[PDB]
Design a protein around this nucleic acid. Sequence first.
DNA 1: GACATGATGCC
DNA 2: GGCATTCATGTC
DNA 3: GACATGATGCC
DNA 4: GGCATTCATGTC
Lengths: 282, 282, 282, 282
Amino acid sequence: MYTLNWQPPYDWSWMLGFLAARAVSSVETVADSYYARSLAVGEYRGVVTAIPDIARHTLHINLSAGLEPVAAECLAKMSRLFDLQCNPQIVNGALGRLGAARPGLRLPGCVDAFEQGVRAILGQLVSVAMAAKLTARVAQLYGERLDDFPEYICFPTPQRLAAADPQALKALGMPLKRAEALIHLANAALEGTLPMTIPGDVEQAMKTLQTFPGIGRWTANYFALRGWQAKDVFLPDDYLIKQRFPGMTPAQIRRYAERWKPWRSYALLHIWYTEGWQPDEA
Amino acid sequence: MYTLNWQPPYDWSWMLGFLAARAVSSVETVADSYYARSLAVGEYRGVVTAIPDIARHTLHINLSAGLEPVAAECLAKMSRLFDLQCNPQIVNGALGRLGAARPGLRLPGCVDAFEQGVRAILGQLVSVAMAAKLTARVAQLYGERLDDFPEYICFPTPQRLAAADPQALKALGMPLKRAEALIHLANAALEGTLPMTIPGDVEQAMKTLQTFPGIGRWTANYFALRGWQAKDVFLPDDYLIKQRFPGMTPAQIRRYAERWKPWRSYALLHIWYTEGWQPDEA
Amino acid sequence: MYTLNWQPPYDWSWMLGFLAARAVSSVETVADSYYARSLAVGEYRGVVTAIPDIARHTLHINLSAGLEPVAAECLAKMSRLFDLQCNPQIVNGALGRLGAARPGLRLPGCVDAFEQGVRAILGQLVSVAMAAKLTARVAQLYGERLDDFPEYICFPTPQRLAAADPQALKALGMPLKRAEALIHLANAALEGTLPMTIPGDVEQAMKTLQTFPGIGRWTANYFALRGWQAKDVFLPDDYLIKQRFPGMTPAQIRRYAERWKPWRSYALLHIWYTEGWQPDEA
Amino acid sequence: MYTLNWQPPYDWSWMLGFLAARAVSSVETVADSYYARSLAVGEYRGVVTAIPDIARHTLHINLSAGLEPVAAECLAKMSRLFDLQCNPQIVNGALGRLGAARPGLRLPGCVDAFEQGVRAILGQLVSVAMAAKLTARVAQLYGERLDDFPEYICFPTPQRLAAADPQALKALGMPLKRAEALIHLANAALEGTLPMTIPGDVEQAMKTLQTFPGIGRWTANYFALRGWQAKDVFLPDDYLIKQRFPGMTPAQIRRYAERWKPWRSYALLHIWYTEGWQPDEA
DNA sequence: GACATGATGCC
DNA sequence: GGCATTCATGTC
DNA sequence: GACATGATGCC
DNA sequence: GGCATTCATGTC
């Protein structure tokens, strides 16, 4: 139905793969040729299906009737998730060989910042597959199901988690703190203290976030990257990044990684996916 | 040449009219058959042009190639500006009579909540034409002209206005406090303190807002209305509203307005743009 | 066994009577000729007895054995409780006829600024009789008893009230918010944010107290008057006072009292205990 | 004239010796057999003199006519300055070896928390001698010279120092930050933010003090020691202490010292005054 | 990983 | 010594 | 109109 | 009485 353009190359397998390693049971559905999920925009809802057209470097988007009144915003969310805006060779041109291996690499964003906020928090300490299982449990319990599509369930809204009880959340399998951090986050959402859109001054914006309970500099950096699609942010405290720069302290990794300015968010993703990348043997 | 749907009726005359009176030179163009303006999404810039198609119950939108990478968000910004989600058959069924004469009414939104904030402030205690000239100045002095279309100019981003001299602003015609308020607002917009999207709790959000220098309840409400497009807001502190509700106080008005919940914003528009209106004896 | 003299006149039947209506059971004993109470200065405990020797305008203070390692401090407390520094000449000369009735009128302070804080808050709304009852109940629940004087119980420390259960204090006959105030006051005392001695800028000090939950303008003034023995404070928003100035709004009364600087506290006392008194409608 | 009791033993030579080394010209006078200094309690000023009576186990204290109205408080201040409450049997008993050679050791207090704070600040980084003359200059400038005894000047009041030009002090001989520190301390004092008396939670009060500009943990501690006469503080950051504990980080010294509570303040002193002192190797 | 705590230089 | 910043610890 | 100040009910 | 909210009122 609706269609959006992107600029070649676009590694859809990599993107669809990435999104799939984090897909949430009953909220998302990832296939080799399309991504599909529940979606809410105020009281409006339904399902969004995105199908790439490698041939016409186009992305087709289908909305269920429930979402039609807000079609546009839906489209905007998808474009932010997929990073259509990305001009692959402006980025690659500044990343030399670091990306040469896969020039179609895009920044996996999100369809909702609050959700991404919840996602980045449950991702603390644990594995990607576990954070997925976890987020599913939280969704299963606090997320509202679709009348129109039973098989689907909407991601928990801010006000549903705000009223949630720590003990209940904790029960799902997370420490008491993690749960409280989630209940705080939802309140800043209702109050509009959590930026749902990429702020002008990202750093300051991030600092503000780290004052939030349960949100450290890692949670803040990663959220900046996914929730805001911040393109020039690196992660010196990331598990892997540590293991990718063996023998270095957070400020040398940051001080090192600052050579990929202003596209560090991309340099980060490349390093994550270059199987055996060791800093330049110089 | 994209296209967006809308449910009829839709008083296009009324809308454009409303947008024309407050149109800012170099920034916006409003003809009786189309609306066009300068737009900026981050660092992407160009010019938007919407052309209502009454036959099709459709809004056509063309995009300056400089905005094609971010077409989706652009389309979303227009849909918010024109209130494309509105199911009038629902709103009017709710207000009954008050909206019987102008069933095609829509809430005139904005293209960017920050811009609309600036606009709200510069709209304080002055005629519409007045403010649309004051503002036009600001956009002339702190705006990013386009190369693709020199004729237009982008609204001042928060970074260009954040680092502005109070006197520099004041000198275009506004108390110093007013120039100060825009400076503040601009800051919250850099550290994500200014909610760029309708928050869950709009009362709370507004209350917070009010602590912002240069912002009172009137400005908060008008901001929530145009900036967030909140549908159940009313301005009992407004100049004309006082006139429409003779000898009645903010409180009296406010609760009389309670009869229109959850669509007090539409009710407002109907009363404003309906000269000679007056409350009942019950 | 200890003497501290005073300048005449000194209305003792009035001082004691006052301290009598407000006397707290099991903590204070007040008769026609002497005053006695439990007293604790840190880990030092014991009873204090005050016996005025009108004939030789000297006050006889006796101290239980446990307080002797801190006699000086006890004496100082006793002297702030009885306003022995007062110079009847200066206040009465400055006041004129206002105090011609009772020149021995003194400013009744306290023995511990925290205690007084707990009294002031409790002295809220209820009658003086009620207050003493309510206060005594708290002392019974949180006070330290004395081995040598089983009939006496020490007034509760901040260390016990900070740890108090608001519901426990509530069950004693006070609104939840009122108990939440005691606890806050108690905590303030622990971190040292409650002035235990008259502060350089009484005014600013008081303004800061009002920021405390539970403390309004009245409590903050009555605290300053009794707890710091500030001599130039007035209670324009007090009950009885309002009666003393019929038809006058706090600001009026208050503008009137300016005529008494800097002995407004003393002024207040006389006007309070001069039943007839009325302003000069000139 | 007045007499205060003290429990034996009391090493008067050491005590008077310690005050002497830090005696401030025109403020204090220290001699083999007595101690004298100016003293103002509100608008009551005069000179205080303390003369120990080894024979009768007592401290004699005379006050100039100016302070007689507030004499009891002068006695209390003196009792705090000379630690008259101290029971050597208790402290020493518990302290063991440490206080075995000089069992008459006492905690040199102060006669005014504020002044003491000032002293703690001015005494930073420089030698006891510097601080003394440094302080002296401050007193001669913002002080209140006594008419009855012109060679004496009352240590400057908060209101006075709060309103001093930070550059005037810089001139007296101190960094501009050491000066703003005084202006700040003085403001806190004007409004009651500076605990003029020992708090319930001494730990929490010190933590708070360090927020004060110019005040660190060292000062915050030294302040709790002399200003509040806290008996359980240690100074693991003192230049000399670090020397008495060679090759031990503050946290280590700190933990070792835990063996002297609740009298770590005394232990400190003892240790301070023992050249070849060193912790037990085991 | 969040978070409190413990271990160079500058001015 | 206060103060800023960057490692390095160590529960939970 | 924002924004100080003063001057009715619900706890 | 604390306290949040409301109706003038004067100012910039």
